[PDB]
Ligand binder design. Structure first.
Ligand SMILES: [Ca+2]
Ligand SMILES: [Ca+2]
Ligand SMILES: [K+]
Ligand SMILES: [K+]
Ligand SMILES: [K+]
Ligand SMILES: [K+]
Lengths: 1017, 1017
């Protein structure tokens, strides 16, 4: 019969029937607006006014009640019109009437609510304010569903939808704010203050917060179908204190502390009660509580003894989880306060259970007349209290004092019955399980709700790895066969990566957005949602806070029944949006330049995951477009042989050993490239390609880019007017150092000239042993035309390369002449047939060094790439290689150069042949006892030239001598940056054998070549 | 017929029959020692001498061959004795002969090997050295298995077992070292140098490394039963280069680079060959290779074109994976070298396949007579080459030059056939899969093996989280029903945490030891093992490097068939060792003091995981002991109610609200405690307990300790002579900040005195809101007696507390007297019946402050704990509370104190009642227009005293006035750190009603109390 009774009846309706329709519209009239007079509105104001002890100003109060009246009358019209329209949807008069009534309803409300929020009296007005706002939200939510069907145009529906969500927030934040400051205003130091304080809290939770808690569910778009919330907050009664005919000083903090702080929800299993005695008055002195987690999903637990052990009588375990729990307490109080020792306790209490039928009430000692049901009344008056109660007993703590006065004041928590002992998932509606109904909290806290949630929330803390915040909720599924998408309501001040598990499998893991800008004063719009992409049928549900850095508030888990067509639709929209975002324009004719080749690959992946069972028509369509995008990417890609199909087959890819092409990957979806290291720095692993001038456009930046799975020591070159080069090390990822796998590199074209034919060299190099790379999706592309500084830089670069060429082209005319003449002086001039008789090796070597002083025969960066001067260097060095060949053939001495180490030589001591300047091999005689010798056949009577090219380290003299058996021995002697002397002599063997013998006196002797030749002109 | 043929025949035996027994002993004689003369040993030396071009010194060489001979003769005796003993194990003569022959065999070998390792010629001796060492290891491995059965005593078997493992390392490191420096010694700049170089490498891999690679398997204890290894190394042939009748200058680096660097193993699928033409000579100009990963577990891949495309003739795909792969190439070479252009290529090659039957050979163009089978001969000569080959063709790369001379020199990799195309797991032997046979390498490299592994290894790099190094190997199980323990051979320089997965499940995750002290020059003993604890029956196998910091080399995976009894045994030993390590001594009578209660809990967990099917007898036994340990822990534990069964039931645990006891946990196995925060700092969450002097021993340190799952703001107190206190924050873990969950805290006892009864207070406190702890397994224990500094510190602490008491005990005699007299002055002296007529509130308040200047009525740290002065403070404050009660009852004014705010008062303006010093409530008149008034009933004719206690802020005068209707109004006026004035007057009502009215002129007026009293003596 009181506002709390009325609220609880709305609360039940809102929990059980929350779904757009005539049942809803009709529900509000029957419960409230159709059946309330001005005395009912008066009654509501008095409830809070009495409490806070100050009445609303009369004009304001008068204004308030006549508005509420205006609205009863209005809404009755809207409801009656709604009803009739429902019965005949197509009747245009019934529809116009719907439109008009809606408009008028929206006017009145917008105007009347500010009059229920009037300064200085916001508090005593709140619950009624809450009423008008609950109603405002539903008409807005109506028009957003039925608007179209009534004849409103989309423009006007979205405007009023935007209003709807603007106002879920506003109205909620308002109520919550004034509840707070009303609550604080009524706090005070004594037990009397506490009674008013708690009574405020309890009454206003019942007529205010509970409704507000349901306000989100008006979001038609978030909650298209029936959606069931659960209120988990606790409310408190305290018999002893609540009708103590006095007040205990400075006790209200002590009393308030005897309420349990924020916890995971638990079921009250039993109370075991201790009787003590004072002047032959027997009383409840202490007691003990057992409890279980939600869903008896854990073992039971307990708490330290409340109050004090007593032994005046046996003790009495009262079991609470029988039927549906305890819904009522009838308590006997005792106050002995004899004229002058003092007593304030309970001598008995009945605990009564909720049942669809009947259960004997468990009595501690005796019943009494301090009925809890005055304070926590039933929600349903169509049945006995045992059936129609609103609350279950949740815990019984205690405020105590001890040995001048005795206080034993048991404190009763009542949780709302919408808080089910188990977490059962429906299948025809969205089910809301608040995270607080969980049973495993690792690295995080429960912290009291701000009022607009129905209860407390879960904080998961920031990390690092094995310290991830985690909340686990047990959940039962009546219907196995039902497919659900999970949605989570959360709050964070930063974007956080979150993983949601279901059973042992992880159904969501990505970074969700921020929603707030501080987690301390939490406002309605501070919360948000995310959902799994798919829908499924394990038996628990969980969230993990992956962030090392920030925390996250988890409100509630939401299970959303879904058909397979719905599923296929969600993913289609998602993928359709992806493909479209590749193109510049609405006609899909061009790619956005900053869309990379690899990106187009990620997006195509999305398409192939679409159902073949429900989306084929519209999936094929999408795959047309993404293939089309890709084709356009290949069009803009200026590199030949993109997929490395023809490396080395010259005008495509140039490549070395230590490369590998596999077709695909964890990362790559197309042919890609693996490069491994080298054992010698001079023999690098290289993939290169020239880009033809004819494909380039003047005065334009170009961009080399691609994707590297991972990398170490990867050397990347871009070469036109000069070479730029990155070294690139990129670690892999799972699912100095580059944090990104995308790379890019820019170069700028000046004037293009086909005749000069610069182009752009693209070169990938690895010159170390540990060393590697995995890359693909390589593009070379046109980016932007050159403007401002970049332009003047390029003009400077070309101009500067232009000046470097002229220089080079001048110095090369000198040197070539010089080298070419030195080359010619080696030969008998008759076209590369013969060496002059008297040209020696040092000469060949000297000519060689004049050839190798040619500066751009080969590109510095990678010397397999011919330079400006490749043509002319090449011909001269071949004339040189011819020359060494001729030197060798004519030498009557086998291996006189030491080019084959020591073969064809007879060696006595310790001697070595070491290479010194290019292929050039030298004999080292390190000690005088060593002897290198060769027997040579000759033509007796002919004449020979013995030529030695060598030098002498240190003291003494090096010798090459020559002889036959007995008298005919002759000698070449050497004594004294690194340069050789050439000596010779004429020898005339008497016989058919000669001996050549190399030796020395001391120090070290070094011989380049020993030659023996016929004198023949 | 050559040493390479002989080696390959041993190699096959060692791969296929590696198992202790007579088959093994008999195998070595038949293959080697029983059938070799001195010419065979000569032959071996010549193989390497010819190669390195320098013969061994004659004495050394002579010595060497006669030792090898001594050993042929000896081992023939040992083998014949082994054989005969096998046939009749119990015959004591056959057993004595076994013992003797073993001793002699061990002597000869120990003496002869140093003569095969002689300075200056270690290299040319190596392979023969390898032979003698292979043999040494097996006799050692024999005696370690059969030793006991021959009659050797355990002392001598373990000595020779220790020798065995000492020498697997030594002999391996030796061989490997000299292979290295022999190989380097023979490197050189030209193609000729390369031929010798590679020929060395290839021949010495075949006669040396391969054997050495098998050396570990001699570890009887690691390999109790048959164990099969796989050689994965590649060897190389190069037809063109290998019988080029000359040498190409500075080409050996170029040639060497045409060998593939370290890779995951792959199967050669096909070669597709390009014919070109030069002067109407048709040649192999280029070619392309396809390959697949091991087990065709991946898609195929390819490589950039080898050589150069040619079009002189069609092109020719030759398929390699037919039969068992290509085992042979017969190659035609071409050398045009016309007197003066140059050519060095192949004009044809036959590829022949390995089959149990027959397959036509695929011919490129034509066969030739450069048979690969001269270089890579068969292992089995009991069958045609097609069946008995040792190698499969593995890859064909190329060394090239191009457009003076042309070189097209295809390079053939041969992998040993023990490298199976698939990774098949046997069931009757241990199967060794080298990690290199994997198909997924993430964050790591393959790097060339050191020689003693059979092939290359896998490096997994240091991290951070989604960059864990990982190696995945595909594996087939012929027999589903077989149970295997996985063992991994690895190397690391630090202890690393490693996770091994099998299929999708993770079968090992813990930190394994270091084995090495640098990963660069890897020695035999640098490797180690770890194993899963259990044994299982997924289809791949993997290791992940969990370290953020260090790298790890993975060699090979080892699968070990096991029965269920074996399993149950492994875990029993493991748990038996755990339980024993709890006790001080061999009689399990005492606990080791540094074994914590929680530790005993971890160890009991280990016991409950033992099989009930195979271990019951010996598991029950173990559970007796661990329960016994635990019982002893409770014995030493000096805390009452360890498992928090009786908190608050006073002489056990003292506890507040916001505590919870659950029975067990992810962490705790026994009753444990959860504390949550507080809303007010003055109302903390507390668990405390005193420890009785009678349980303490003089001059001894004690230790408080326990385990905290997690914690924040946990305040821990230890109190005797003074209080020490930690604040403790401990993050949780998965499976300022404390990195450990174990805590401890120490205190020291001086002299114990039962009369003074200090004890030790143990207090857990949380005084903040965010704030929590989860702890259990709490012990208070005796640690050690006090010695040295600690002793003199404690003597100082007690002495100092002793001096603080005397002080306290002196000051308390003064104050108590003072306070007690002030208390008494309040009363009419007749036992606490009445207040003196003229004692006012300020007096009561002044007396109160003299009571509350009592210094240790309550323990500072937690004021629920009575102090020295709790008794005397308590009585006096009750006399005070009596006094306030009396003040109130006699005041004819209702609520004249403002202790119930403003009730019983009529208020006109804005006025407030604020609490100021304890419960003391004051009326604040802030403005002159305000009016607080009360109508009081009186007895006409009697006489009353109107007393006011108040003061005046600022200007003007505060008034309390009193009156009846018309002429009888009188007044108390107040004008002018925080202290009150008391005024009064005598009033005599003519009527039955009086009015009391509080007011003021301006400024602010503050009233403590207004009292009206009858004058009655
Ligand atoms: Ca030379
Ligand atoms: Ca007062
Ligand atoms: K906020
Ligand atoms: K152009
Ligand atoms: K090492
Ligand atoms: K004692």
């Amino acid at each position: 019969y009181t506002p709390i009774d009325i609220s609880l009846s709305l609360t039940q309706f809102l929990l059980s029937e929350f779904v757009p329709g005539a049942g809803f519209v009709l529900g509000l009239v029957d419960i409230i607006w159709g059946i309330f007079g001005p005395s009912q509105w008066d009654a509501f104001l008095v409830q809070i006014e009495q409490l806070i002890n100050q009445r609303i100003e009369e004009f304001a109060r008068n204004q308030a009640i006549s508005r509420l009246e205006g609205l009863s009358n209005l809404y009755q019209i809207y409801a009656e019109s709604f009803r009739e329209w429902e019965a005949d949807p197509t009747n245009p008069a019934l529809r116009e009437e719907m439109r008009i009534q809606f408009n008028d309803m929206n006017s009145a409300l917008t105007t009347a609510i500010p009059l229920l929020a009037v300064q200085n009296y916001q508090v005593p007005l709140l619950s009624v304010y809450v009423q008008a706002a609950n109603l405002h939200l539903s008409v807005l939510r109506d028009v957003s569903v039925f608007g179209q069907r009534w004849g409103f145009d989309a423009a006007t529906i979205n405007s009023r939808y935007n209003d709807l969500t603007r106002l879920i927030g506003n109205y909620t934040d308002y109520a919550v704010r004034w509840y707070n400051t009303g609550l604080e205003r009524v706090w005070g130091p004594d037990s009397r203050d506490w009674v008013r304080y708690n009574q405020f809290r309890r009454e206003l939770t019942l007529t205010v917060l509970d409704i507000v808690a349901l306000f989100p569910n008006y979001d038609s778009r978030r909650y298209p179908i029936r959606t069931v919330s659960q209120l988990t907050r606790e409310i408190y009664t305290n018999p002893v204190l609540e009708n103590f005919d006095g007040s205990f000083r400075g006790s209200a903090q002590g009393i308030e502390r005897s309420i349990r702080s924020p916890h995971l929800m638990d079921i009250l299993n039993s109370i075991t009660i201790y009787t003590d005695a004072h002047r032959g008055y027997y009383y409840w002195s202490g007691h003990q509580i057992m409890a279980s987690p939600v869903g008896f999903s854990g073992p039971e637990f307990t708490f330290p003894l409340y109050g004090t052990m007593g032994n005046a009588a046996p003790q009495q375990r009262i079991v609470a989880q029988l039927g549906q729990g305890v819904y009522r307490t009838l308590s006997s109080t005792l106050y002995r306060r004899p004229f002058n020792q003092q007593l304030s306790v309970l001598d008995g209490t009945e605990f009564a259970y909720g049942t669809s039928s009947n259960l004997p009430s468990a009595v501690y000692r005796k019943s009494g007349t301090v009925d809890s049901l005055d304070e926590i009344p039933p929600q349903n008056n169509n049945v006995p209290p045992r059936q129609g109660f609103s609350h279950r007993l949740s815990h019984v703590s205690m405020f105590r004092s001890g040995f001048v006065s005795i206080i034993r004041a048991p404190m009763f928590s009542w949780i709302h019955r919408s808080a089910e002992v188990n977490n059962i998932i429906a299948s025809d509606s969205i089910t809301q399980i608040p995270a607080v109904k969980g049973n495993f909290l690792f690295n995080g806290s429960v912290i009291s709700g701000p009022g607009f949630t129905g209860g407390d929330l879960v904080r998961l803390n920031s990390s690092n790895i094995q310290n991830r915040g985690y909340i686990e909720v047990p959940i039962h599924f009546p219907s196995t066969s039902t497919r659900y998408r999970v949605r989570v309501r959360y709050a964070s001040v930063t974007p956080i990566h979150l993983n949601v598990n279901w059973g042992n499998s992880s159904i969501f893991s990505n970074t969700v957005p921020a929603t707030a800008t501080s987690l301390d004063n939490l406002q309605s719009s501070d919360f948000g949602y995310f959902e799994s992409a798919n829908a499924f049928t394990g038996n628990i549900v969980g969230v993990r806070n992956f962030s090392g850095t920030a925390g996250v508030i988890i409100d509630r888990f939401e299970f959303i029944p879904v058909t397979a067509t719905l599923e296929a639709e969600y993913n289609l929209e998602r993928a359709q949006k992806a493909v479209n975002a590749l193109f510049t324009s609405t006609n899909q004719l061009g790619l956005k330049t900053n869309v990379t080749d690899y990106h187009i690959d990620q997006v195509s992946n999305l398409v192939t995951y679409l159902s073949d069972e429900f989306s084929l028509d519209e999936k094929r369509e999408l795959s047309e477009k993404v293939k089309h995008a890709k084709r356009l990417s290949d069009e803009r890609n200026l590199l030949q042989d993109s997929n490395f199909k023809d490396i080395n087959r010259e005008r495509g890819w140039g490549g070395s050993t230590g490369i590998t092409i596999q077709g695909g990957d964890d990362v790559f979806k197309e042919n890609y490239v693996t490069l491994s290291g080298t054992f010698d720095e001079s023999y690098p692993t290289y993939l290169y390609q020239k880009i033809d001038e004819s494909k380039l456009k003047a005065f334009t930046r170009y961009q080399l880019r691609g994707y590297i799975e991972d990398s170490q020591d990867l050397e990347i070159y871009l070469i036109r007017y000069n070479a730029k080069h990155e070294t690139v090390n990129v670690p892999g990822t799972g699912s100095s150092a580059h944090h990104s796998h995308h790379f890019s590199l820019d170069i700028d074209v000046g004037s293009t000239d086909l005749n000069e034919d610069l182009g752009v060299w693209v070169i990938f190099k690895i010159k170390t042993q540990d060393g590697h790379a995995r890359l693909g999706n390589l593009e070379f592309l046109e980016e932007k035309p050159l403007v401002g500084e970049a332009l003047a830089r390029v003009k400077r670069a070309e101009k500067k390369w232009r000046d470097k060429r002229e220089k080079l082209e001048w110095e090369t005319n000198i040197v070539y002449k010089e080298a070419k003449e030195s080359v010619d002086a080696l030969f008998v001039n008759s076209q590369y047939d013969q060496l002059q008789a008297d040209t020696n090796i040092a000469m060949i070597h000297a000519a060689d060094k004049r050839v190798h002083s040619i500066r751009e025969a080969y590109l510095p960066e990678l010397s397999v790439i011919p330079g400006v001067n490749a043509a002319i260097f090449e011909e001269l060095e071949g004339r040189i290689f011819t020359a060494f060949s001729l030197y060798d053939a004519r030498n009557v001495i086998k291996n006189g150069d030491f080019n084959n180490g020591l073969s064809s030589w007879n060696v006595k001591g310790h001697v070595d042949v070491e290479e010194q300047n290019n292929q050039r091999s030298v004999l080292v005689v390190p000690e005088w006892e060593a002897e290198v010798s060769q027997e040579v056949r000759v033509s007796p009577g002919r004449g020979y030239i013995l030529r030695v090219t060598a030098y002498k380290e240190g003291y003494g003299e090096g010798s090459v001598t020559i002889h036959e058996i007995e008298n005919n021995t002759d000698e070449l002697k050497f004594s004294n940056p690194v340069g050789y002397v050439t000596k010779e002599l004429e020898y005339f063997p008497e016989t058919d054998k000669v001996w050549i013998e190399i030796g020395e006196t001391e120090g070290t002797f070094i011989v380049d070549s020993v030659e023996l030749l016929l004198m023949e002109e």
